[PDB]
Paper text:
Phosphoketolase (XPK) belongs to the transketolase family, a member of thiamine pyrophosphate (TPP)-dependent enzyme superfamily. It converts F6P, xylulose-5-phosphate (Xu5P) or sedoheptulose-7-phosphate (S7P), which are intermediates in RuBP regeneration, to produce acetyl phosphate (AcP) and C3, C4 or C5 sugar phosphates. XPK is an enzyme present in many microorganisms, primarily involved in substrate-level phosphorylation to produce AcP.
Given the importance of the physiological role of SeXPK, we solved the cryo-EM structures of SeXPK, both free (with coenzyme TPP/Mg2+ bound) and complexed with the non-hydrolyzable ATP analog, AMPPNP. In contrast to the published XPK structures from Lactococcus lactis and B. breve/longum, which exist as dimers in crystals, the cryo-EM structure of SeXPK is a dodecamer composed of six dimeric units, forming a circular donut-shaped array both for the AMPPNP-bound form and in the absence of AMPPNP. Using cryo-EM analysis, we discovered that these functions were enabled by a unique allosteric regulatory site involving two subunits jointly binding two ATP, which constantly suppresses the activity of SeXPK until the ATP level drops. Comparison between the free and bound dimers in the same orientation shows that the two subunits jointly bind two AMPPNP. The key residues, H706 and Y710 from reciprocal subunits (helix α24 based on Supplementary Fig. 3), sandwich AMPPNP in the dimer interface by forming π–π stacking interactions with the adenine ring of AMPPNP. The α- and β-phosphate groups of AMPPNP are stabilized by H706, H719, R721 and R753 and the γ-phosphate group by R711 from the reciprocal subunit. Of note, while the dimer–dimer interface in the SeXPK dodecamer involves residues near the C terminus, the B. longum XPK octamer involves residues near the N terminus. As the donut-shape or four-leaf clover shape-like particles or two-dimensional (2D) class average images were not in perfect symmetry, we further examined whether the assigned symmetries were pseudosymmetry. Some relative random motions were observed between different dimers in both SeXPK dodecamer and B. longum octamer assemblies, suggesting the likelihood of pseudosymmetry in these structures. The root-mean-square deviation between the structures with and without AMPPNP-bound is very small: (0.42 Å from 7,897 Cα atoms of the dodecamer and 0.36 Å from 1,256 Cα atoms of the dimer).
Author numbering:
A (entry chain C), B (entry chain D): 9 to 796
Write the structure that this text describes.
């Protein structure tokens, strides 16, 4: 009897459906007189109309039917909204269920509450027109389109009984990120994870153009969505009387198959990739609004996308049509005199946490358990002498991540775009593997590292991975993202969205608990250009992240492996941040042992006393580095200067936290003027060697008292192919150019260092000539060790 | 007989195939002794191996077969390479055809030429490992994956007889941009445009993971690629003896269907969307290389992706295997004593421009005709009084673009992501329409503006549009891209690729002629937030573009419609640039008439004399603006100051060319120190009101003599929903905050302007309170006109 729809139940569901639309339209238009007790007048209409209408009925249409199966089958559901402009529909149902009144006591279920509820939407000092963090039961802001689908899969991970109902607009489906995220079924495990129920809201139109997926034939539509691995179900029509029964049956069909798929997998009898059920819903745009306006068809057309009538404040004719639109919902039989929904509506409202707007998963910070972090000092490489030993920088991190996975079998995951092996993080493969539910071959047994139980997820689409991870954190869990720095620009749009979400959730919204940080590891830099990656890779992603704020993002550039461990350990505890860690996978020198590394990361920036020779004296120059390749060149330059200028006093400063450079006025995390003057003196030149565009340092530290003595060398440009030393020479960040820069800046070396400066230019000439002759650097360059 | 393959022809084709692989492997490994006349020794091997091997045989496999049909059917073809790391294969065939020797006389077809040809690849001072602009017959650098498919469609536009053979790697297909660009068949007109022949190189593996599209079943593969609208053809196997004949038949089948499709369409008998032929090629990775290395299978596995044996310089065992690998191609029977290919190879080499590496389309700048630009002064709005009249800013540009389309029916196009109507550029719809070959309905007749003959292209995927336009320019044609500024971050990766391509083509490569500029119009700004677009939209894309260089990118922020016309007219003539024009679609004031606008854009920056009152005197303050909304606030602030401080002298400067602010030392285009001191004085405060992040101005103009007096107000952050004046108040760019800033900075107003400053803060309080009360600004704010 679950598939069939009772006429009595059909009426109550239809009653809820209209009330949701009525509240949606009221939010768009009304600022006063919520229930049409008195004739509508221009003083009740909002001056500026920013809400969108063409998608609201469809979202409410599915939402009331989703609540039906929750009441019947006791399903645990989440609502993820593709078109974020359909916010009123979600809020209306949130208010109808009673969630919004509990979270916001001002917007009660009364006439006075409705007045505040209607006036707040898309209003200065109110709430936005998208699925902002202020929305109860919301994890995804659909303002930027293409990421709703991935967030459904991310939230589904390690939530076996959860089902995430994600509604997808046909216009959104034309975007690149969402077209590739359909293949996420191959990495979702039916045994341990939940289900995603994709609903294609094929209203037939974008803002102003038809959607191609609507204008592509039905046969090719089913062909496209079986090739994605889904079992597609089609509900088409325009008359709700038929469509209420038809779509209730389809949703009943889908849930049984989802449970049948999960039952088959968890029993172990069918350990294969299943054909997940997906719904294709073709309904008119602006479904229950005006039919035509000024002789142009509006409903079921792109003209209904935002607002069918935007001149209602101007001419009374449309104003009467607006009031006629509202009364078509028959609000007199939907709400009582007080302003609450009628008891028929309250009957079909789910109860407590079973409500999709009050599910604690959406407010994932309440479901967040801190990771049991093993002591990273067990994985710290031994550094008996600083800078005299070479070890692979990322392998200790791989071993540390292995022990985190061991102690957090479900709460933690790894995400990587087919680069985990290249990034040299294979230590995690010792305990787990990579997720794969596609076809398997015996050749995968040797080094494939493929299993459905794996805690590491791999796909070449960077958009898919970022959406997977962001949803995983917002549901109250932990993760780590590792990728090349060359392709970081691909996810720049997605990072902005998540940073937006975190910043609002901290300051504006008070009831949303903190979630875990977004930890990103840019594992291959632009200085050590390996085989893969384009020639002109740029560090520009770092500038984009620092563009957001110091109170939501953190940038770390640890110089060695122990410093990488402390940074990763520190950032696996921080909550409301986007942590971007820039480290290189090549074999590098090691500088700090576990104790010294931990103290260095706690400060974020500090003097290296072994690399300095200014103890108990005023340094003639401060050499600072931020990165690992540029740190090596800065250290090598320091060695060269000390050989040729024995009396020269050099203070070596290494900075790991980029944002420490900002003054404490901007953010509390930054250094004070006294602290900054202690590290970098008030009047001596600073030769800063930065892994990135040099102006980023100037943007951060422009207000310091010694900024006029700050001289930053960083990434400028590249050739087609360069050796590691030649590439540093092109950007003037190599050891020889840095030594020249120190000679130019130190006042008592311009006259005295002329002969050394000529010798340094000779070395640049010799190494370039050898580079063009052999294709690599000299052995003494590659095997350079810290002297002294 | 075209379908069947002669055994004599099969041998010569196989002879070409092995020689191409041999040259490819020689480029990867050898730096000396090209032909194995003497035993291989470590001094002949390259020190560092950066080339990739797993894709080279597949590219050469298709390439030799593509040349077959050129010789038979006289087809005009282009080779677009998906995996850019497969550069050696393209270069080897380029050398084999003789193109490379003609372009590069140093690399002759001899033994001495081969020594230079082998030693140059992936070498310092040589050439890169990707499809850089130095490659003959190359339009697309496949280093960043996901854009090869779109570039095929872009180059195909308005080239009816051209066929673009684009080879697509299975790993690349997992990326977001390429998954959505498959639907580009719906916008390609068989009647007027050429064909794209997509070849899916499904080698089964990525760098280190299996490709899901390979591990998805064959049935679901055909289902996926018929849903994209393609007729898929499958060639599978590993034995070339069978695969040579099978593949040749499939390519023969595809070309006939492509011609049959074009013949049916151009006769007019079948004006429907056709099922384009697409090839799915499943071959082992590292197809003709080592079978196993160190007990691990390499060929047909991810272990062959880059280099099967990377220790050949270390141990002689692999060194013998490398020489055994080379001799498996039997080079003795492929090259003569001199070093040229044998006459059998020369027989099957195409001739002249029919060679894909020597096709003049790829060097599109030779095929570039300058647009016949109508005088924009016909579309200039009348401005009898500056700043006293309001007109829609983008509509005159739409009319101007309409006349360009009229005079350039084939050489020009418009690209937009479902925003042309929103951007208010509908004037172009008066002469043309939008491309659409999907299903048509009678409802589209009213305002659909849909026709297959349209010169405007629409799709919600911004990745697809950018790839379409870049290829269109690189083939020697013109275009204009219009989109919102909110979603500009989506195409940031693609823009970097094209900027990279232009910069190399100007300085490094000498034989590549200039092509047309990339003209981008960010038509909706972040200050006038309309219905669509997320709340926290940022101008950060401007910072990303200025990141590249002043010698390849230009940023224009015209204040009014006449400045927009002059800027667009000026930028439709420039060749080797990425032109980004930031304009707003809202109804705005108009400031300059056609004559004054043209002079202003010629300077790029200049004093507005009507808005100034410092003529013949030293100005107390310089108020500068860069944008249109911020220009209005700067002008309104100027009016407020002149009302309350009649003696105050204000010079108003408007800047359209952002890069003029850079000193002439960086680039010739920038202003000199004398010119800059003329506009902005040497010692007076400058209140700069910028449409964007304020630091961008400081990055550009830090070297100026008066930079210490430069005070920039720009975009900082947003609330959820704000009125236009309230949003400007939040960022302190409104008229009242600017007037306060002038009071603070002018030395003789700190004491004297205290009472006005208190009044200004009262206005800020009053307008915010009104905004929270009504939801819009006061009528006098919305209808503000320039006084005086
Ligand atoms: N005040 C500044 N504001 C912003 N960027 C700056 C500033 N000063 C320098 N830069 C940037 O820093 C880089 C080099 O300048 P800088 O770090 O000062 O080293 P420098 O050797 O002193 N160069 P210069 O200041 O011109 O003598 C360039 O990319 C500049 O754009
Ligand atoms: N010398 C500088 N180098 C780089 N960025 C700068 C510099 N001075 C200011 N900025 C940037 O400019 C913006 C605001 O400063 P600014 O444009 O100078 O206005 P302001 O009122 O003068 N603030 P202040 O300089 O601290 O008194 C921020 O993005 C700063 O990072
Ligand atoms: C890549 C991109 N291009 C354009 C937009 C502008 N935009 C915001 S909402 C929207 C409508 C989405 O279309 P559709 O999925 O059909 O939604 P619905 O009909 O449910 O409103 C568009 C185009 C965007 N957000 N992203
Ligand atoms: C989005 C993205 N992720 C990762 C890479 C790194 N990368 C460069 S080339 C390459 C191989 C592409 O795989 P496939 O299409 O299978 O190519 P082929 O087997 O022909 O080498 C990869 C993963 C990239 N360029 N872009
Ligand atoms: Mg739609
Ligand atoms: Mg592959």
């Amino acid at each position: 009897d679950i598939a069939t729809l009772s006429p009595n139940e059909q009426a109550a569901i239809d009653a809820w459906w209209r009330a949701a639309n009525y509240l949606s339209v009221g939010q768009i238009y009304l600022r006063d007189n919520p229930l049409l007790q008195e004739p509508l007048r221009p003083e009740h209409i909002k001056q500026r109309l920013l809400g969108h209408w063409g998608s609201d009925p469809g979202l409410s249409f599915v939402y009331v039917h989703l609540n039906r199966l929750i009441r019947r089958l006791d399903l645990n559901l989440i609502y993820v909204t593709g078109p974020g402009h359909g916010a009123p529909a979600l809020l209306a149902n949130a208010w109808l269920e009673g969630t919004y009144s509990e979270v916001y006591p001002n917007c009660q279920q009364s006439t006075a509450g409705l007045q505040q509820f209607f006036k707040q939407f898309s209003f200065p000092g109110g709430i936005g027109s998208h699925c902002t963090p202020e929305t109860p039961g919301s994890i995804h802001e659909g303002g930027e389109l293409g990421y709703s689908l991935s967030h459904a899969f991310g939230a589904a991970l390690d939530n076996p009984d959860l089902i995430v109902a994600c509604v997808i607009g046909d216009g959104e489906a034309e975007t690149g990120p969402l077209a590739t995220s359909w293949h996420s079924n191959k990495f979702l495990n039916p045994a341990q994870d939940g289900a995603v129920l994709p609903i294609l809201h094929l209203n037939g139109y974008k803002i102003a153009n038809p959607t191609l997926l609507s204008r592509i034939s039905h046969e090719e539509l089913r062909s496209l969505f079986i090739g994605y691995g889904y079992e597609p179900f089609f509900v088409e029509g325009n008359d709700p009387a038929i469509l209420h029964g038809v779509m209730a049956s389809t949703l009943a069909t889908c849930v049984q198959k989802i449970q049948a798929i999960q039952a088959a997998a968890r029993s172990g009898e069918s350990s294969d990739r299943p054909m997940w059920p997906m719904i294709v819903l073709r309904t008119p745009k602006g479904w229950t609004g005006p039919a035509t306006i000024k002789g142009h068809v509006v409903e079921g057309s792109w003209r209904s996308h935002q607002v069918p009538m935007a001149d209602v404040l101007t001419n009374p004719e449309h104003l009467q049509l607006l009031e006629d639109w509202l009364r078509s919902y028959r609000p007199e039989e939907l709400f009582d005199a007080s302003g609450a929904p009628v008891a028929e509506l309250q009957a079909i409202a789910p109860i407590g946490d079973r409500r999709m707007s009050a599910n604690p998963v959406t407010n994932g910070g309440l479901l967040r358990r801190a990771l049991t972090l093993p002591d990273f000092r067990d994985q710290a490489v031994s550094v008996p002498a600083p800078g005299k030993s070479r070890a692979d920088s990322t392998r200790p991190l791989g071993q540390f991540l292995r022990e985190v996975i061991r102690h957090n079998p479900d709460n933690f995951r790894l995400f990587g775009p087919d680069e985990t092996a290249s990034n040299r993080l294979d230590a995690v493969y010792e305990v787990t593997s990579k997720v794969w539910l596609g076809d398997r071959i015996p050749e995968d047994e040797d080094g494939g590292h493929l299993s459905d139980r794996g805690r590491v997820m791999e796909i070449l689409s960077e958009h898919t991975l970022e959406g997977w991870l962001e949803a995983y954190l917002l549901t109250g869990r932990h993760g780590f993202f590792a990728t090349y720095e060359a392709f970081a620009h691909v996810i720049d749009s997605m990072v902005n969205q998540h940073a937006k979400w975190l910043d609002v959730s901290k300051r504006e919204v008070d009831w949303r608990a903190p979630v875990s940080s977004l930890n990103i590891l840019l594992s291959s830099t632009v200085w050590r250009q390996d085989h893969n990656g384009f020639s002109h890779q740029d560090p520009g992603f770092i500038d984009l992240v620092t563009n957001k704020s110091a109170r939501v993002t953190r940038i770390y550039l640890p110089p060695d492996a122990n410093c990488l461990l402390s940074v990763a350990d520190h950032c696996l505890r921080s909550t409301d941040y986007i942590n971007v860690i820039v480290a290189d996978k090549q074999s590098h020198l090691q500088y700090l042992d576990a104790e010294a590394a931990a103290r260095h990361c706690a400060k974020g920036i500090g003097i290296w006393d072994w690399a300095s020779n200014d103890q108990g004296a005023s340094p003639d120059v401060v050499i600072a580095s931020c990165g690992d390749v540029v740190t090596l060149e800065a250290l090598a330059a320091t060695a060269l200067l000390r050989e040729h200028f024995p009396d020269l006093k050099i203070r070596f400063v290494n900075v790991v936290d980029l944002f420490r450079l900002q003054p404490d006025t901007e953010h509390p995390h930054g250094l004070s003027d006294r602290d900054f003057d202690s590290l970098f003196t008030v009047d001596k030149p600073i030769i800063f060697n930065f892994h990135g565009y040099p102006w980023l340092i100037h943007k951060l530290a422009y207000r310091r008292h010694n900024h006029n003595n700050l001289h930053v060398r960083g990434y400028k440009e590249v050739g087609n192919i360069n050796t590691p030393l030649e590439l540093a020479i092109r950007n003037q960040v190599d050891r020889f150019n840095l030594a020249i820069d120190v000679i130019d800046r130190v006042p008592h070396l311009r006259d005295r260092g002329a002969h050394v400066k000529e010798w340094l230019k000779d070395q640049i000439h010799d190494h370039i000539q050898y580079a063009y002759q052999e294709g690599i650097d000299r052995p003494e360059i590659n095997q350079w060790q810290w002297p002294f």
